[PDB]
Ligand binder design. Structure first.
Ligand SMILES: CCCCCCCCCCCCCCCCCC(=O)O[C@@H](COC(=O)CCCCCCCCCCCCCCC)COP(=O)(O)OCC[N+](C)(C)C
Ligand SMILES: CCCCCCCCCCCCCCCCCC(=O)O[C@@H](COC(=O)CCCCCCCCCCCCCCC)COP(=O)(O)OC[C@H](O)CO
Ligand SMILES: CCCCCCCCCCCCCCCCCC(=O)O[C@@H](COC(=O)CCCCCCCCCCCCCCC)COP(=O)(O)OC[C@H](O)CO
Ligand SMILES: CCCCCCCCCCCCCCCCCCCC(=O)O[C@H](COC(=O)CCCCCCCCCCCCCC)COP(=O)(O)OCCN
Ligand SMILES: CCCCCCCCCCCCCCCCCCCC(=O)O[C@H](COC(=O)CCCCCCCCCCCCCC)COP(=O)(O)OCCN
Ligand SMILES: CCCCCCCCCCCCCCCCCCCC(=O)O[C@H](COC(=O)CCCCCCCCCCCCCC)COP(=O)(O)OCCN
Ligand SMILES: CCCCCCCCCCCCCCCCCCCC(=O)O[C@H](COC(=O)CCCCCCCCCCCCCC)COP(=O)(O)OCCN
Ligand SMILES: CCCCCCCCCCCCCCCCCCCC(=O)O[C@H](COC(=O)CCCCCCCCCCCCCC)COP(=O)(O)OCCN
Ligand SMILES: CCCCCCCCCCCCCCCCCCCC(=O)O[C@H](COC(=O)CCCCCCCCCCCCCC)COP(=O)(O)OCCN
Ligand SMILES: CCCCCCCCCCCCCCCCCCCC(=O)O[C@H](COC(=O)CCCCCCCCCCCCCC)COP(=O)(O)OCCN
Ligand SMILES: CCCCCCCCCCCCCCCCCC(=O)OC[C@H](COP(=O)(O)O)OC(=O)CCCCCCCCCCCCCCCCC
Ligand SMILES: COC1=C(OC)C(=O)C(C/C=C(\C)CC/C=C(\C)CC/C=C(/C)CC/C=C(\C)CCC=C(C)C)=C(C)C1=O
Ligand SMILES: [Fe+3]
Lengths: 75, 488, 494, 100, 123, 79
């Protein structure tokens, strides 16, 4: 379906084209750079998803400790 | 013994690399054989490399930064909060440096010492974030400030740059003296300067009738210094003049990194310490004043840099509302606002630096930009609408929390002020869009296309601004994590 | 909870259609004008057909929301958003999808200078407005409504005729944003009680009579700006006159309906006690608007200014209908909303036909056009009759049903609202006779052209829709009655 | 009474610096000198407190603050020099071009 | 050719900050600033548009009252710009913004004093 | 003329624009360009901080919060 790899590749390709356009160059001026951008975007998106999972995992434990410290009041 | 210094590997590396670049630059800039080559861009690339290696060392050694914490305790304190703060600071410094190469070569600003001073100020801000004692905090703040004074005056034959430097040094030194006085009063009243000791002494009493006027005025003076640093009204008027008169890369750097560092400091001093409602009221009144004055003064501006300076003043008012309400969500919203404002400011100054190749000065100089560079006019329009807070752009987050904090805390006057100032801000932000898209001037200014570095940075920041609210979970989680780590 | 719907044709794809069109058009060179024109037109037409299909699969017996599907924002799933329609929002989706291709067709001749930016702006508007009409959540209703401000601002400012478009665009943006911020404040107050912004839940929570008063005022401050109600109506003439023709069509035919849709969708069912308490207030404001604005219309000298002022009187009649809180009232309010969206759009198209040739909006320059443009004259007369609520036209059904609804509640408000029959006739016939009847004035205009094939085709569906709703409104009312009935009953159990 | 007398000495120095800022609107060199006076007063505050509290932290920080004062004066006088070089004068009317 | 550039030329004299008088040329319908930029008496790069919104009095000139009566009176915005751009924040009664003065045939022979250039090139 | 283009314009976009322009004008003038004004402002803010937030104990006998904020606003209408 719509995987992080595909979103990232599309974003990387779009980044290269947007960069070319900003410089008033043809969209496909250096195509190997478009390939590089697709690769980097895919890698970035997959890493962002994994990081998000890890971040939620750490926030869970940290909220657990906060809750325990708060519950110590009613002892 | 050596392993103890794993807690300061990032800082050791960046300091040593800065020394290496200083020596390299001075040895070859003076070389007759090589015909005194300009080394600003060479040293800039090597320093960008050094910043990225520092970021790698810091990010990949998250647990190791807490090693030997008892041995380092009376010098600094590294934790989860300082971890993410320092990463964001290094990322901002890297972006700012990357935006400087066209300025180096086309203006011919050949001074490589500019890069060295930026790197030393980054060292200072790194130490600011991890400071856990009034002495360390003051020293790191002073290192940062002295580097800025020097770089603000870098165009040393320019009337504007010399004026900026003079105003900065005088007003900066005055505010630093006020802050140091506050620190001395707190030490004299408590016998302590370490943040842990201050927390223990001050907690549970606040103003219990028999309040230490020494402690109360030390806090006040320190707060005055902090408010000067964050350009909060009424300690703000240095900022527009310095921002306009400094070289534009300096203005871009000052607009972002010191805010990160000083808010780290403010959180860890006040939030982690204890006088209480008085100080949150300080930031309350300064937030309202900053929003009102920023909106009105920005509406008065005809020049781009001054407009952005006043815009930043208004936004620090919006951010300080979060510090004022004194809740975990308040801290989280303050952090979210800093991150988003920093990425928007990076976008805006990338555009400004691109346009400075044709000497953009006035808002009216943007006329017919939608004709001479359509994709650039759209990109700049997205930045403006994000600054205005129009959903679903990333800037909408700060407006949303401003009203979220007012309605709940019962602050109806703050909500009133937020509505009015948001509408004023939207007017002066869409005035730029009108100038680029609706006006038909008789004389056009044709702008030179930007370099690859700024185009790539602009492309990424423009996707973030448009698409952040499709996938905002990592920022939300990371900032909740940081807010919690201040106390646990 | 994943609320994914069984139906093949659903709401998300209809959202995605103009988005995909816009992305494709982003990358096509401006030299390929024909390709840009065809791609935009075809995307809009496919979206229209998709909405027609959505009308066929609609179930006219339930009070629930249909095609309900869900849309999941965070893995924590605390905040999850839903789309769905009913018998009150369906025809507005259809009207939006129908009007957008008309907008692309009106600018067909000037597309070589308009560029792909024109089509992209209108497609983005289409996506945002369909989203707005399809949202079961206060907060996303907010987010998608404010978003339309950006492309509308661009449309008015760039392709407006003269430099007054600057002031017009500023005023449009600032008025609408002020109202939107008020309703954001209301949304946050609701969230503090309930912990949610999901419409279905808020329809099943109880608000205090006091909390209802404050929340109703904060909703009213957005919606009355949107309607518009007096005295925050003054942005409308400037904006609807200075905009390009298609921009005026979208402004009058769709954007104006968002305030009445907000009244129908959130204010009346969420706060029934406040709705009852404020009913005399709404009646007074609307009656004042109808009389005063109709009389102001009478003294306007600009074609577009006359058509734009007419919309204020029509929308305030709509508000009277919807706040009558019975079947005739709400049914007539919805029918008049749709009919106005057709009729005012056609009238703006007529004025645009005149302006594209002659470049003046001043009535005094025209006259005697029946002898040089008989086809335009006939079509203009038909839509003039429709704007007077002539029986047989679509607007009469909604107008009379609203008067029926109002009379059963308050005979005075119905009596003040029926004065519109006299005043609207007066200004509509005066406009038509000053433009079309009389003699030509060759010292001002001496060269003429009747409608070309594109203009005739553009007018045909408006004529068909007006007559169709006028003579057999049962097709629309049958699909709406269950939703309207449940809206009328919400909050009471006898 | 020792501690109140030592503190009011440093306090008069600090107030004198404030007054020097207030009274020297055409003389920014004296404004810099007034800022040094304030810094000296703070340094004295740290030393007095160190003795009164029998604690060394006030003394370490005093030395470091002296280092900061030196660097501050060096950089400030450099900026003064270059401003004078650009304008040929130190009058305040020639450093007021950034405004608004 | 029955329509010449000479039909629109306006004879002018400008006194430079050193005091020396120069005979300069401009077109009717264009601004005094453009005429002054033709020979570099005012740097064209310092004032690239003829708009009051892009003006920090880089175009400022001093004109004697005999020629001031032949010009339209200064608008409020012009006086605002002139006063704020003054070092002493004092409005000079003979000061005009060169970008707001449109040359006409009636200004043939006008004498204009160009003051010393203010800093303009913001870092 | 009396309403739409009259009173509603004056207590609306026409009047609002006029006042906010004059006020933005006044606030811009406070950024005078003089370093002495900027230092004086910092001193005034510091003095305000000490005065209101610590020396408002006895004050309350003579003083009220109503009069405080009234005199503030009233200052706008001077000269
Ligand atoms: C709905 C959001 C809320 C409201 C905000 C709206 C904000 C915009 C306002 C809307 C009004 C109309 C806006 C008109 C803009 C459309 C025209 C446009 O931007 O076209 C650009 C196109 O700009 C772009 O480059 C946009 C690129 C963004 C990429 C985003 C897509 C990401 C995935 C796509 C993957 C690549 C393509 C796949 C298919 C090949 C052409 O730029 P030029 O300056 O004319 O020329 C560029 C130079 N050259 C053609 C030679 C290359
Ligand atoms: C600008 C908004 C007006 C001033 C700010 C304000 O009063 O905000 C209110 C915004 O709400 C409105 O009614 C907006 C009025 C807009 C008209 C001006 C919210 O306060 P409330 O009194 O409605 O809520 C109190 C409640 O009982 C506690 O739960
Ligand atoms: C916040 C509510 C405000 C309104 C409250 C209700 C009404 C109270 C009574 C009216 C108050 C305002 C009275 C204004 C008197 C007229 C002043 C005037 O001179 O009018 C000028 C225009 O100014 C106004 O009319 C002021 C408009 C005020 C409208 C509201 C102000 C702003 C409100 C929004 C911001 C604050 C929000 C606060 C919310 C609590 C016309 O400019 P001129 O230079 O042409 O005048 C020449 C003169 O006639 C002699 O020849
Ligand atoms: C697998 C597809 C993607 C692979 C990409 C290459 C491998 C990755 C290595 C890193 C690539 C990063 C991007 C390299 C180009 C960066 C920008 C350089 C542009 C520049 O200003 O300097 C140019 C140097 O050329 C250059 O830097 C390019 C030099 C030669 C590289 C081009 C060959 C790429 C191979 C692609 C697949 C080949 C298939 C067979 C293996 C000089 O520009 P100029 O004067 O030379 O001309 C340019 C005509 N506008
Ligand atoms: C600026 C633009 C944002 C950059 C785009 C998004 C970045 C995504 C890259 C990360 C993907 C993979 C991360 C790998 C990973 O989990 O390893 C960790 C590295 O974290 C990292 O790489 C942390 C990245 C943090 C990003 C900056 C956060 C800023 C916070 C905003 C506050 C600003 C206000 C400051 C006053 C270390 O492993 P670990 O998980 O064991 O380490 C923390 C234990 N506690
Ligand atoms: C027009 C009508 C309104 C005029 C202003 C009304 C002033 C009184 C408002 C008031 O009582 O202010 C309190 C403090 O707010 C404040 O923050 C104090 C007032 C604002 C001070 C800062 C702004 C000063 C002006 C800045 C621009 C001009 C610069 C100088 C020329 C609000 O109470 P609360 O919000 O704390 O209640 C929290 C409850 N939970
Ligand atoms: C999150 C929203 C969505 C984002 C999308 C993510 C997708 C990933 C991005 C994909 C990138 C697509 C393009 C890749 C191919 C281009 C390769 C660059 C070629 C290169 O070597 O560039 C050099 C310059 O460096 C450069 O131009 C590189 C520096 C660019 C600046 C960015 C990095 C700076 C440091 C980090 C900033 C962080 C800021 C955040 C706070 C030489 O270029 P040339 O040979 O043309 O000669 C220029 C004249 N001197
Ligand atoms: C400090 C922290 C700052 C980090 C900034 C966060 C990124 C900023 C967002 C701006 C550009 C991102 C585009 C939005 C994504 C649009 C679709 C959202 C979506 O569901 O995509 C998922 C995420 O993709 C991605 O990973 C998105 C592409 C990354 C660029 C892939 O879905 P999944 O199932 O793989 O992920 C599990 C959650 N759906
Ligand atoms: C039952 C009682 C209540 C019932 C309802 C009654 C409400 C009364 C009416 C209130 C609604 C007013 C809406 C404000 C819109 C103002 C539009 C003015 C904009 C305009 O067209 O002119 C601009 C003026 O902007 C400017 O320079 C001015 C700044 C922009 C104005 C925004 C300020 C509004 C903030 C909030 C005010 C209301 C408070 C709400 C409680 C351009 O001017 P130019 O040509 O000089 O510009 C340079 C050109 N590019
Ligand atoms: C809120 C309640 C209504 C506020 C109305 C503000 C009107 C402001 C106004 O026009 O007064 C001017 C002073 O402005 C001021 O001093 C405005 C102060 C701030 C007002 C808003 C807070 C004097 O103008 P004028 O009435 O003398 O003009 C006619 C000259 N012939
Ligand atoms: C600014 C500060 C300027 C001074 C420079 C500070 C860093 C340079 C320190 C160089 C001596 C390090 C040393 O001898 O340690 C090994 C050395 C091992 O001796 P070996 O067994 O004979 O190799 O370690 C020790 O036992 C002594 C520990 C000294 C404290 C080190 C503090 C600095 C740590 C950062 C080092 C960064 C990587 C360089 C390591 C490889 C060096 C060969
Ligand atoms: C047009 O006529 C004129 C006036 O009229 C505005 C004037 O008076 C002035 C200028 C005199 C003034 C206003 C001196 C007062 C300055 C102060 C208070 C310094 C403080 C700094 C600034 C820039 C104001 C911001 C301060 C605020 C909002 C208060 C502090 C913040 C909190 C609430 C915490 C002049 C010359 C004038 O000719
Ligand atoms: Fe000028």
């Amino acid at each position: 379906p719509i995987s992080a790899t595909m979103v990232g590749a599309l974003l990387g390709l779009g980044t290269q084209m947007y960069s070319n356009a900003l410089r008033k160059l043809p969209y496909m001026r250096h195509p190997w750079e478009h390939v590089v951008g697709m690769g980097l975007g895919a890698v970035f998106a997959n890493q962002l998803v994994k990081w998000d999972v890890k971040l939620k995992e750490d926030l869970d434990v940290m909220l657990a400790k906060a809750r325990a410290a708060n519950e110590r009041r009613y002892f | 013994m050596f392993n103890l210094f794993l807690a300061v590997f990032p800082e050791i590396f960046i300091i040593n690399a800065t020394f290496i670049l200083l020596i390299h630059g001075v040895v070859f800039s003076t070389s007759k054989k090589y015909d005194y080559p300009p080394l600003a861009s060479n040293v800039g690339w090597l320093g960008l490399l050094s910043v990225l290696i520092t970021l790698l060392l810091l990010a990949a050694g998250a647990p190791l930064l807490t090693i030997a914490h008892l041995f380092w305790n009376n010098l600094f304190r590294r934790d989860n909060f300082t971890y993410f703060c320092q990463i964001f600071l290094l990322l901002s410094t890297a972006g700012t440096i990357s935006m400087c190469f066209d300025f180096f070569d086309q203006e011919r600003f050949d001074a490589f010492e500019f890069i060295v001073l930026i790197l030393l100020s980054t060292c200072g801000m790194l130490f600011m974030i991890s400071a856990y004692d009034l002495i360390a905090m003051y020293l790191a703040i002073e290192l940062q400030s002295l580097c800025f004074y020097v770089i603000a005056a870098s165009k040393r034959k320019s009337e504007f740059s010399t004026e900026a430097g003079l105003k900065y040094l005088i007003l900066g030194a005055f505010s630093s003296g006020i802050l140091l006085f506050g620190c001395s009063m707190i030490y004299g009243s408590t016998g302590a300067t370490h943040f842990d000791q201050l927390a223990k002494i001050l907690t549970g009493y606040e103003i219990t009738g028999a309040r230490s006027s020494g402690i109360f005025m030390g806090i006040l003076f320190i707060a005055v210094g902090f408010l000067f640093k964050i350009t909060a009204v009424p300690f703000h008027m240095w900022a527009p003049d310095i921002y306009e008169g400094s070289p534009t890369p300096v203005t871009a750097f000052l607009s972002i990194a010191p805010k990160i560092s000083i808010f780290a400091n403010i959180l860890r001093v006040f939030i982690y310490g204890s006088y209480g409602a008085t100080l949150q009221q300080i930031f309350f009144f300064c937030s309202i004043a900053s929003m009102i004055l920023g909106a009105l003064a920005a509406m008065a501006q005809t020049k781009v840099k001054r407009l952005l300076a006043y815009s930043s003043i208004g936004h620090v008012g919006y951010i300080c509302i979060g510090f004022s309400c004194g809740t975990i969500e308040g801290i989280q919203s303050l952090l979210i606002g800093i991150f988003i404002y920093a990425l928007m400011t990076m976008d805006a100054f990338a555009i400004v630096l691109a346009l400075r190749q044709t000497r953009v000065k006035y808002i009216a100089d943007l006329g017919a930009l939608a004709k001479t560079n359509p994709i650039l006019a759209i990109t700049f329009s997205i930045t403006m609408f994000s600054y205005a807070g129009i959903p679903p752009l990333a800037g909408f987050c700060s407006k949303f929390y401003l009203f979220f904090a007012a309605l709940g805390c019962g602050a109806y006057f703050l909500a009133l002020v937020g509505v009015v100032t948001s509408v004023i801000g939207c007017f002066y932000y869409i005035r730029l869009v009108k100038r680029m898209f609706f006006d038909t001037p008789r004389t056009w200014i044709l702008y030179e296309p930007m370099d690859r570095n700024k185009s790539l940075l602009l492309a990424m920041t423009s996707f973030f601004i448009t698409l952040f609210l499709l996938y905002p979970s990592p920022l939300f989680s990371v900032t909740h994590q940081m807010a919690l780590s201040l106390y646990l | 909870l994943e609320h994914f719907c069984e139906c093949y044709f659903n709401l998300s794809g209809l959202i995605l259609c103009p988005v995909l069109g816009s992305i494709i058009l982003l990358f096509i060179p401006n030299s390929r004008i024909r390709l840009i024109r065809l791609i935009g037109l075809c995307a809009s037409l496919i979206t229209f057909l998709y909405s027609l299909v959505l009308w066929i699969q609609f179930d006219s017996s339930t009070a629930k929301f249909q095609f309900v599907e869900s849309l999941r924002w965070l893995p924590y799933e605390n905040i999850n958003f839903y789309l769905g329609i009913d018998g009150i929002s369906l025809f507005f989706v259809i009207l939006t999808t129908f009007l957008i291709p008309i907008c692309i067709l009106v600018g067909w001749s000037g597309m070589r200078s308009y560029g792909k930016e024109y089509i992209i702006a209108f497609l983005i508007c289409e996506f945002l407005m369909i989203a707005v009409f399809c949202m079961l959540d206060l907060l996303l209703f907010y987010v998608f409504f404010e978003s339309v401000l950006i492309p509308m601002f661009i449309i008015i400012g760039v392709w407006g005729s003269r430099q007054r478009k600057i002031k017009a665009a500023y005023q449009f943006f600032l008025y609408t944003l002020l109202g939107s911020l008020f309703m954001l404040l209301a949304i946050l107050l609701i969230l503090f009680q309930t912990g949610t912004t999901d419409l279905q839940i808020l329809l099943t929570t109880e608000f205090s009579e006091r909390r209802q008063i404050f929340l109703w005022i904060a909703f009213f401050a957005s919606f009355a700006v949107k309607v518009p109600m007096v005295p925050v109506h003054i942005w409308l003439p400037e904006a609807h006159v200075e905009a390009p023709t298609a921009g005026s069509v979208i402004l009058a035919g769709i954007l104006l309906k968002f305030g009445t849709y907000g009244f129908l969708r959130f204010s009346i069912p969420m706060f029934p006690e406040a709705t009852l308490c404020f009913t005399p207030f709404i009646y007074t404001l609307s009656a004042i608007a109808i009389i005063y604005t109709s009389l102001t219309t009478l003294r306007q000298i600009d074609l577009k200014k006359i058509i734009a002022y007419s919309s204020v009187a029509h929308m305030n009649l709509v508000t009277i209908g919807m706040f009558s809180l019975n079947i005739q009232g709400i049914g007539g309010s919805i029918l008049l909303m749709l009919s106005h969206g057709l009729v005012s759009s056609a009238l703006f198209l007529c004025v645009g036909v005149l302006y594209d040739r002659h470049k003046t909006r001043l009535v005094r320059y025209y006259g005697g056009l029946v002898s040089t443009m008989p086809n335009f004259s006939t079509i203009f007369f038909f839509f003039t009759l429709a704007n007077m609520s002539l029986p047989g036209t679509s607007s009469f059904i909604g107008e009379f049903l609203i008067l029926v609804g109002a009379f059963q509640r308050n005979s005075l408000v119905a009596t003040l609202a029926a004065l519109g029959m006299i005043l609207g006739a007066a200004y509509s016939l005066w406009l038509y006779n000053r433009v079309v009847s009389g003699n030509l004035k060759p010292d001002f205009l001496h060269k003429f052209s009747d409608l070309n094939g594109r203009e005739v085709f553009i007018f045909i569906p408006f004529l068909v829709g007006l007559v169709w709703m006028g003579v057999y409104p049962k097709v629309f009312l049958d699909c709406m009655h269950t939703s309207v009935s449940n809206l009328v009953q919400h909050g009471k159990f006898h | 009474m020792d501690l109140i007398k030592y503190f009011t000495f440093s306090m008069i120095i600090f107030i004198l610096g404030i007054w020097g800022i207030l009274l020297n609107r055409r003389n920014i060199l004296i404004m810099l000198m007034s800022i040094e006076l304030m810094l000296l007063a703070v340094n004295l505050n740290f030393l007095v407190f160190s003795v009164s509290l029998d604690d060394m932290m006030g003394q370490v920080f005093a030395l470091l603050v002296l280092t900061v004062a030196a660097a501050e004066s060096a950089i400030g006088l450099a900026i003064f020099v270059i401003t004078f070089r650009v304008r040929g004068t130190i009058a305040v009317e020639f450093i007021n071009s950034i405004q608004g | 050719g029955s329509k010449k550039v000479s039909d629109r030329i306006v004879k002018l004299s400008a006194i430079d900050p050193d005091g020396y008088k120069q005979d300069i040329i401009g077109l009717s319908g264009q601004t005094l600033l453009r005429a002054l930029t033709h020979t570099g008496l005012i740097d064209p790069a310092s004032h690239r548009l003829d708009d009051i919104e892009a003006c920090s009095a880089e175009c400022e000139v001093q004109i004697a009252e005999e020629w001031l009566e032949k010009l339209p009176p200064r608008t409020y915005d012009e006086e605002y710009v002139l006063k704020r751009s003054s070092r002493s924040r004092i409005l000079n009664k003979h000061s005009r913004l060169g970008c707001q003065v449109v040359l006409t045939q009636e200004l043939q022979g006008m004498v204009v004093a160009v003051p010393e250039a203010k800093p303009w090139d913001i870092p | 003329e009396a309403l739409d283009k009259g009173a509603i314009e004056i207590l609306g976009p026409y009047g609002i624009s006029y006042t906010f322009r004059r006020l933005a004008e006044r606030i811009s003038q406070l950024q005078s360009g003089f370093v002495y004004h900027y230092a004086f402002a910092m001193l005034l803010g510091l003095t305000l901080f000490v005065t209101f937030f610590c020396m408002w104990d006895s004050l309350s006998s003579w003083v009220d919060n109503r009069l405080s904020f009234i005199l503030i606003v009233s200052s706008f209408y001077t000269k």
